[PDB]
Every structure is written in C-alpha cells, then in structure tokens.
Design a protein around this ligand. Sequence first.
Ligand SMILES: CC(C)=CCC/C(C)=C(\F)COP(=O)(O)OP(=O)(O)O
Ligand SMILES: [Cl-]
Ligand SMILES: [Cl-]
Ligand SMILES: [Mg+2]
Lengths: 287, 292
Amino acid sequence: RVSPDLARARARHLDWVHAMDLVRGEEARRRYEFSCVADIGAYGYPHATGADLDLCVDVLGWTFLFDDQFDRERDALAVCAELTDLLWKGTAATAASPPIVVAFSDCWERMRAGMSDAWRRRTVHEWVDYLAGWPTKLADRAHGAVLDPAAHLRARHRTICCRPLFALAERVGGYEVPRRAWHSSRLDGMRFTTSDAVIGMNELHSFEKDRAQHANLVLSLVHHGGLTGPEAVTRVCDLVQGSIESFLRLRSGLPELGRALGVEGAVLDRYADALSAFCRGYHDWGR
Amino acid sequence: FEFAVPAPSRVSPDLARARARHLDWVHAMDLVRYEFSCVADIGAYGYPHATGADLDLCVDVLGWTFLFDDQFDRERDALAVCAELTDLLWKGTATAASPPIVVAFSDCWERMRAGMSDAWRRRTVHEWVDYLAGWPTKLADRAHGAVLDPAAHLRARHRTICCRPLFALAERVGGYEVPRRAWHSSRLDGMRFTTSDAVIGMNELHSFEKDRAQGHANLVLSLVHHGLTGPEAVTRVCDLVQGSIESFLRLRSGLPELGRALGVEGAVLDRYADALSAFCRGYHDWGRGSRY
Ligand SMILES: CC(C)=CCC/C(C)=C(\F)COP(=O)(O)OP(=O)(O)O
Ligand SMILES: [Cl-]
Ligand SMILES: [Cl-]
Ligand SMILES: [Mg+2]
C-alpha cells in the first residue's frame, strides 16, 4: 500500500528541503528527487494523508539527509550534541544553528504536538539513542577494523532509526499504546524483530555502495565467519525471514497480552499493523 | 560454578570503614526505615583499588541500585521515580518534595559527576537513563506474567543489571576518562557488552534456585520453557559466560591496534580493560559467596 496523498506531499517536501536549506541547487534538487527519499514516508505510513503524511515524509527525508553528513567530523559531532540538548532540555534552534538542526526542530515540534509527557519521554530517549550511534560510526571508521557481525548489528539498531519511526506511527495514527503494554517485552520484541528485518534488507540494498566506499553486515560475516559472499547473504536473508517469523509469533500473542494487562485489543492490533506496514513499506520502496 | 575471569581476586582494603559509613548513609537518606544482604560489599569487590571517598561512592551507588530494585519487589510510585530521575539527569538539576530514592540518587550523582568533563557527563547521563528504561519493562512483564524467550530476557537484563553506569563510575574513581574516539568505538563498546553478558549469565546461575522457588524470571527457566532439560539449560548459560569471557579477551588483544589507529595512549586503554575485568571478577567472587 501507498498513501493516496503522495503527489501533493512529494511536491511540498521538495520545497521544504529547499526552505530548510538542506538541499540547495538545481543539481542537488534533481539528485534528491531521483533518490525517491521523498516517497518513503508514503510507503511506510500508507494510511497517512495531509499534514500527517507531510510529517512522515519530512522526518524520513531528514534521516537520509542526516546520514549523508557522515559520508567535517567535528561538525557532525557538534550537531549530535546540539540535537541531544534540544531533545533533553528543550533548547531552541538559533540563527547560528546549522540547517540540519533547524530542520529537526521543525519536525520535532510537529511530532511531539498532542502527545503525552510519557510518550515524549520515551521518544526523546529513542531519538537520543539513535544519535548515540553516530559517534560510534565515526570512531569505527577511524579505527578501520572489520566489526564482528553482532557488534555491527548492535550499532545499526541505533543508526537505522526504526524506534523513533515507530513512535512516529503512534503520533500520526492518533493513539498512544498504553504504558503497561508498550514497555512489555512482547511489544519491545515486535519493535526489535521489525528492526532486525529492516536492517537486514537495508544491508542488502546498501551492500555495493558500502563495499565501494564502509561497514556492512555481509562483509562482517565474510570476514569473521569465514563465509563466502553467497553464504553470508544467505545468512542475512535467514535473519530477515527468521525475524518476520518471530514477529508473527509475537503478534499472535497480542490478544493474551491485552487480556493479561486489561488493554483494548484494537490498539495493540493497530500498533502491530503499523510495525508490519513500515517493514513492508521499506521493502516495497526498496524494490 | 567458577569461571576463568581474566583478573585476580582482590578486595579493597578500606571495606570495613566503607561498609559502616554506607549503613549510616542509607539511614540518613531515609532509604531503610539490608545489612545482612552483604550488598554493602560489592563495591569493594568491583572496584578493588578504590579507597576512601572513591570507595564510598562505589558502595553507595551499588547499594542504591539494590534499594531501587527493591521498590519493584506502589508501581505508579516507581514510574514517577523513573520520570523524576530522568528529568533530573537530562535537565542537569533533587528538591524538598523528592522521595528518598531520588534524594539519594542525586546525592550519588553530584559526587559521581564531579571532576568529569561535559562529554563524559553526557554519555553517562544517557547510560543512566537507559538503565531507568528497563524497569518499566520489568513491571510490565511481571503484570503480563508470560515466560520471556531467552533473547528477550537477555535484552531486558542488559538494561536493569546497571553495568554500563558502573563502568563509567570506574573512570570517575580511577582518575581518567577514555578519550572520546576510543570510548565510542565498537571495540570498547564490545568489551562493555561482553563484560555485561558475563555478569548477567553468572547472576542467572547464582539466582536460579531463588527465582525458581519464588517463581520469578530466569534465563535458565526461559531456556527450559522455550528451548531443554534443566541441566542442558544450565550448561547453555555456562557456555554463554565462558564465550563472553573469551570474546572479551579477543577484543582486548586488539587494543594496541586500536591505540595506534586512533592515536590513543595504550596505557589508558589497558587501564579501562582492567577495570571491566576487575568488575566482572569482583561480581564473580562476591556472587559465589548469602542472598542466593
Ligand atoms: C528509513 C530506513 C529504515 C532506512 C534508510 C537508511 C538510510 C538513511 C540509508 F540507507 C541511506 O541510503 P542512501 O541511498 O541515501 O545512501 P548514501 O547516503 O550512502 O548514498
Ligand atoms: Cl498503562
Ligand atoms: Cl577523542
Ligand atoms: Mg543519502
């Protein structure tokens, strides 16, 4: 599925990256439009329309443009610190703030609107835990060692940015998963297995680019597992397929979770639908 | 059950004074309204070179984590405490209205952050807050009552065991900060992770009989349920601990190259590695000797 409001949202988002001074110039605008990053929000949140869809598109595009920064290391680290302070303390973007910070704040003021203090606290923490992965990326690049597969995955569970994007699904879907359910290992496991699937797919999409330039799960498996490329790729495919099977087993336990905790079944089913829609959306967009 | 942790058995020589002071501190903090548990000793095992006020801080922080844990074993109160501590850490601010567990944490944190750089404070704040994040999960899972699968149990434990803030504490009381470019590397993060895995695994074995008797979560029990016989599950957990120690040592053998690649002095990396190993060995020796 794709949101029916994509055409308007795409054109608006291309103006927004220009207005935020993130994508400057005819060549950069064309490159950015060709990348179809301006569309993923409509695949990952296929029921969002209007301003909700704009927020999804802007946030997704922001994460791509943030990622582009690292590929001027002190500048990127300075951004991580300014964003951390904005999230932790509510410090405002200023005229001296770089475009990437101004644009994040523009997204975040919309994303936190209408959400409870509890949701804001857990979502702030997820944003900052995503930011915590980027110093690691820079340090690992400077080190130059091939990460072992498990260490690569621990790092990517931060930089892939799934958990803030799952929080965004609540914000645009119009609900908050009740606290007693959201913190359960059953739902955290659904977040974790969805993230594993998305990471695995992304590692395969990114393989050739990463090898030409960066860390990649396939390369780590070759180096540390003594696997051939084909064998390592099979291992990643098995990770994705096993993560989907695990997600489905957990999802079949949501009625019992609802009964045990006194939580309405509808909100649990809706949240699980959002996680699977994000995964399916990234998969379809990536093809 | 004994494991070949790569650090010698040692205890701080200042344990006697530190223990008696800590019991006075928990009373003055109005936390105990505990001595017999011997929790007041782990700090001298986990930080065997600390003395004086440095050791007191270690003992107080460790004891605080056990007394915080006791809250869960008034759930709305515990969540309100997590929220207040999170805001205190994030915003850089305890007040007269704060409950005793918050006053006591702030008492610890003001000593723990003293003399440390803004960079260290930022990463350590994040570690403290990630630990606070595990307790809503512990309360939710208790209310749910389902047997966690082994991987989910370990993911939850990696927050609540409180190893990462305690590794940061080793820098504070040791007198050094690992340079930023090395601290954030996956090489050192992997040494933190494998140390934590080993401590978790040892604790699951130490606690097995109690957890099963009292019907609480335990990795061995999760493996029986979702996997194994009792003995097979115990062997699996022992293999986890030994594999984590072996992985830590393989990572440690790369510290000279890390130091050369990053322009970081070899001495501070070895000192950090020794602190992680001393913590693991300290927990090993302490846990092997009444709580369980
Ligand atoms: C939204 C999710 C779940 C995943 C996307 C992860 C990102 C930001 C990339 F793979 C960057 O892709 P890109 O084509 O921009 O690669 P380069 O920036 O290296 O050219
Ligand atoms: Cl609730
Ligand atoms: Cl540095
Ligand atoms: Mg890009």
